[PDB]
Design a protein around this ligand. Structure first.
Ligand SMILES: CC(=O)N[C@H]1[C@H]([C@@H](O)[C@H](O)CO)OC(C(=O)O)=C(C/C=C/c2ccccc2)[C@@H]1O
Ligand SMILES: CC(=O)N[C@H]1[C@H]([C@@H](O)[C@H](O)CO)OC(C(=O)O)=C(C/C=C/c2ccccc2)[C@@H]1O
Ligand SMILES: CC(=O)N[C@H]1[C@H]([C@@H](O)[C@H](O)CO)OC(C(=O)O)=C(C/C=C/c2ccccc2)[C@@H]1O
Ligand SMILES: CC(=O)N[C@H]1[C@H]([C@@H](O)[C@H](O)CO)OC(C(=O)O)=C(C/C=C/c2ccccc2)[C@@H]1O
Ligand SMILES: [Ca+2]
Ligand SMILES: [Ca+2]
Ligand SMILES: [Ca+2]
Ligand SMILES: [Ca+2]
Lengths: 387, 387, 387, 387
């Protein structure tokens, strides 16, 4: 039975802790994969943490990070949300140095890009087998969300980028049913730049807040209709939500074009709330440390900088990193609306710490009807490790 | 299908061993969480050990206990009753430095309190997702049972405390259906003090024997009707059942008020038997060592000190600690009545042993139709460990 | 749906390897329980290895065997047949320093005896919970099969011994339905001695070949009708099948009384074949080394020493030990008859090897329509271990 | 419900990565079996990696390879495709130093040959139990595919060899239903030589490309009709596909007889494509290093050397080894045709590397509608290990 994700996103005063896996502390002695980009997606029955494995284990010579991001040993695997990315509970998903995964109601669909940078291959899995394939259309590191993809009425949608990391690239929407690609569209977005989209179903369409790694501190935003018509631009709110970024007071927002004169970036998320936005961001405007979620009044549709609520979840004394979006299925939450939820990756080791290795642990938050007090559910590992 | 827990508690001559997990001995070489407060609750199909993890593993630097009780790395997880709290069979439940869990017949409901002491948050999970939330109402370490909660006809009930550990605090009953709080009541109990309740269903109402950490050596007792009307007071029997406590002969019992002039305490349990009580208690009146269960004639309703049966389960040469209550569902035991069962936590390491770490193993006993001989199913680990 | 075990035992020319767990070799680096007495019983859907754990792990200080056989840390757990007794795939069964387990078609029933030698308690589990209890009736180490028990038409039967290890003791049959004891009978057997019975269903009754630890080199044999009437005596064949034992040529068989003037013994098995017997035995008549299965013509009902077939399975250069019986359910094998199967425990470490510890691995053989060549599927661990 | 494998093999432009287990890198610290011959077979619901375990673990004294290939500690076990052959997720299949496994739609059938070389025994398992047996018919190391077997309409077929490794031997087809052998035929093939067949269902018959270890660089090929009539010979294409082998230009192909004057060999695969062939082969013509798949036009039925497509999957700088065939069931892929898929074993350690041990990791590729770029998904372990 196909999941209907046609409802509106729940309006939410605050965010409550869902889980915390404790990957790295546990991996001081347990058998834990060295991972990065640990996103969450939910099936009608259970939510799971997916993650790229570097194919090695914490506290072992193979975690020696000289090993490439985009290596043949990089696999997409998963476990249940809140469990560490450990070998003995891991489920194999796909070979991928960049990934997206989402469940439609019957089965899991996953998309793992691997292979050489000039002609990468993306295998689409459905229910545990390859079902279809996308090739590099631009010969420059084919990539995708690193976050849950979005299934509405049996059809699953996702965004992909082919091209340079720091100048104009090419961006596409892709549409599958039961693991077969059944539609796709280029995204006309000049000067603009889109990477690592964080999407969620909302009102029968698909909203993503993604990353601009070229010019913009604000995040690109698109809304994909079921016929892969779309609208694209930037999260309107007059507050930079990327990293690095300039201070809030030196930033004029825009619904149209990038703002800020910085390159680089980091993956983030945002949730539409009527016309408001819940937008996540690192606390540091410089590095990937600390994490907070601001609610800007009218920020989805205005250059507003009127802030209703702010809730710290990782304090500025602790490393954070990637963040992404997903919803709770109605069939799990009880609600008549789609509960917004996010995860926050917390990076330990290189480049900011003196270890041979790099990995991350995560924490997942879900949208509730109440204000939740500020806190810091930071990673917690005692660095360095035995090496 | 909802579990009916409306039956009476089985009248039981004695207690038979259900399980013994051997957590700490096993964790000398295996991959075992460092845990505390390892209670048991049963679903129509299986009983499980829940436990707070300190997020680290035995024989590892992160077990270094300087780490706070109420830390962001403290998670509620579980395994099947009798299995050790090991990583590779663990199921994630919630982020919580204080927890309660119970199954209603369809799904598991869990409640994990985490966050800062001045405004703690309790996320209610249902079937593996956050469904509702309680906030600190008194700004002083929001807490709960550390024992199975109680589901009668689909609705699950539990007790919570907001306030000081050593003077008057505030106590509430809470009532959920399918993860949504649908009712709650304050508990008018002045001079009295309630913490870490050990509840069980009995006669269509909910009976808890809880801990008074302020004035009383005897245990508070409440009986919650389905409309959250209640009665509250103390276990009548003229025998102190807390720790520390005075000797039996210097103690006049009371159904109304605390007795003994000691502060402190430890979590314990008791089971109504018509008018008698099966009351558990440490053997030492000073420290948490050894464990025994006395049956006092008319002790539920009298100041009686008439003891019918006594059964040692952990001898005074061995560490014990927390204890709690739960029943076997009819759908599991075969019986027309609710089998009383308890667990006993057995604490090793700090503060009484010279290790860096502290954890505990457990043993579960269930009510039977026969006298069972005294014995000691103590923890057994050979301290200290490699460190 | 209840298993009918009313069929006849399959007539079988030979025995084929079912499994080999490799427990001890694997436990040189893996996380493997230190075990003894690893028997097998089958459910309509899967066969499992049960085993007493000493509660510790190979290559760890807690395996230090000074630890008692009959300790409070001794638990009955299980895994699927052929898998090692490892922590992360183990299922908890009961607290027991002596055990029997068997499946009736709906659920697993297990029986774990634990507690003090003067008044031991046997908890009967059904579907994962205590359901009933037997107490010491003779105050001298209550014990049982260490082998699969036998379920015919929903009712499960097993044999127990209360008394001395080396002179007359007391022996009982016990009969459960759904975990409730519903019948029992004393076994009038003077001068005779019964321990550690190896039973199997055959022709709607229950046949056990058990061990006499007092006087007899030949094995006691009983046949339990559904009304717990019985016949008891000795396996007729004129060949000693216990260990230690005298040579075949100095042994006159008997259907009635023990023969041989030795005390001691070891657990073994035998399978009726019309009037023949398949009888297992160590190769060494002195120690527990090597294993073979002889088919004696008319040996169930005669003092015969006419040997049709012999098949070595563990050679005299390798340690063996315990052996037991069980059948394959029709619902698994396809056959219209009950396939005889046995397991052979293979003991490493103390007393015969210079280690601190003692454990064993196993191998399971099933009855087939062909002669199978002699071989040795011995344990294989390289002793001693890191200690 | 029985799987229909009666469809034609999908015509496929290229091969996409299915999985990569990372066994050996992971086994630098994790608990990983030392394995060889890690093939894949699929059930209607999931594909699994089967493998011979040497019964020991990486980084342990028991991996010390002096241990025989054909030892009593050699077991067939399995895990889900893409997961490493680790102890805690392993499922026991059979005792076997040579194996084949395949699922018919209802259950798994496995065939494990073990025992002495002069009279080896092959136990057939069905749904987890021994159901039937084949004995050595030629007294010279009874062996089989090391690759998925083939189930068409409930009946499963497989090829076996009894005889010398380097001169004429004997070869048989075998046909089971529900674990009972129900048919078999000798394969009249003089001068020819057949070992380690790699089969797949195609057009309602069974096609195997196998290994000739006597005279031929080209691979034997057979096509087994459901009545075990057959045709046998050699893959026609004028290109040697074994290892070692001569260069392509010095090789005249044949549909009839072996070509090349070399002994030895290694297991490989091939897939019929109408009249073309997808044939796999090591890159090195000398050693087992690198892996590629050529599509020869008309190569199934001609001496053609017209090459349409070539796709490297493991580069000549990296060890490869065994390869085998299997299909995706329609009930998994969605397709109206049978998706060709193969796996490639990647051997580390002895004989080519300076370690005490030998094992291998694998990677699985499935047939798709597109050209996939060359790459190398090599094993990746950093040799030697701690030993
Ligand atoms: C496809 C890819 O490699 N994406 C990068 C991505 C970056 O290249 C741009 O978004 C594309 O222009 O950015 C980052 C990043 O910003 O940190 C990552 C995440 C790093 C994973 C990692 C870290 C340490 C060792 C191995 C892998 C990703 O691996
Ligand atoms: C919510 C809380 O922290 N409760 C305490 C509780 C105590 O604070 C009072 O009941 C509230 O007034 O008491 C105890 C206790 O009496 O020992 C505990 C249990 C200790 C868990 C622990 C032990 C060592 C290291 C880390 C955690 C609990 O952690
Ligand atoms: C109930 C019991 O303890 N049975 C013994 C049993 C023996 O006492 C007689 O049968 C009863 O009279 O015999 C044996 C035996 O003959 O070896 C055992 C098995 C030993 C298990 C063990 C070995 C080493 C360390 C810990 C336990 C059993 O543990
Ligand atoms: C049945 C058997 O032993 N087959 C061999 C097989 C070889 O004997 C011929 O095909 C039969 O004539 O060939 C090979 C091979 O060509 O390498 C193997 C695979 C080796 C497994 C292994 C490697 C190292 C240590 C232990 C086992 C197989 O083990
Ligand atoms: Ca940027
Ligand atoms: Ca007190
Ligand atoms: Ca004897
Ligand atoms: Ca050859």
């Amino acid at each position: 039975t196909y999941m209907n994700n046609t409802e509106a996103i729940c309006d939410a005063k605050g965010f409550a802790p869902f889980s915390k896996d404790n990957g790295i502390r546990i991996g001081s002695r347990g058998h834990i994969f060295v991972i990065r980009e640990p996103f969450v997606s939910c099936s009608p029955i259970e939510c799971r943490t997916f993650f790229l494995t570097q194919g090695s284990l914490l506290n072992d010579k193979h975690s020696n990070g000289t090993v490439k991001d985009r290596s043949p040993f990089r696999t997409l695997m998963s476990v249940e949300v809140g469990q560490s990315p450990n070998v003995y509970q891991a489920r194999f998903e796909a070979v991928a140095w960049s990934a997206t995964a989402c469940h439609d109601g019957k089965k899991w669909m996953t998309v793992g890009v691997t292979g050489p940078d000039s002609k990468a291959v993306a295998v689409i899995h459905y229910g545990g087998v390859p079902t279809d394939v996308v090739n590099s259309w631009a010969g420059d590191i084919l990539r995708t969300q690193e976050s849950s993809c979005t299934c509405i009425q049996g059809d699953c949608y996702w965004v992909m980028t082919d091209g340079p990391a720091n100048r104009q690239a090419q961006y596409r929407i892709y549409k599958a049913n039961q693991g077969r690609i059944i539609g796709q569209t280029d995204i006309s977005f000049n000067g603009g730049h889109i990477e690592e989209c964080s999407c969620y179903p909302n009102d029968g369409k698909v909203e993503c807040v993604c990353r601009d790694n070229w010019t913009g501190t604000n995040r690109p935003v698109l809304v994909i209709s079921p016929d892969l018509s779309y609208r694209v631009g930037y999260l309107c709110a007059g507050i930079p939500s990327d990293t690095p970024r300039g201070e809030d007071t030196q930033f004029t927002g825009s619904c149209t074009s990038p703002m800020g004169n910085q390159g680089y970036g980091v993956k983030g998320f945002g949730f539409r709330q009527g016309t408001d936005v819940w937008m996540g961001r690192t606390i540091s405007r410089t590095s990937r440390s600390g994490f907070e979620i601001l609610r800007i009044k009218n920020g989805w549709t205005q250059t507003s900088k009127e802030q209703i609520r702010k809730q710290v979840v990782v304090d500025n004394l602790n490393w954070s990193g990637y963040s992404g979006s997903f919803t709770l299925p109605v069939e799990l939450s009880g609600k008549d609306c789609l509960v917004p939820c996010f995860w926050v990756e917390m990076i330990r080791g290189k480049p900011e710490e003196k270890t041979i290795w790099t990995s991350s642990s995560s924490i997942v938050m879900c949208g509730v009807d109440y204000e939740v007090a500020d806190w810091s559910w930071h990673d917690g590992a005692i660095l360095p490790f035995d090496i």
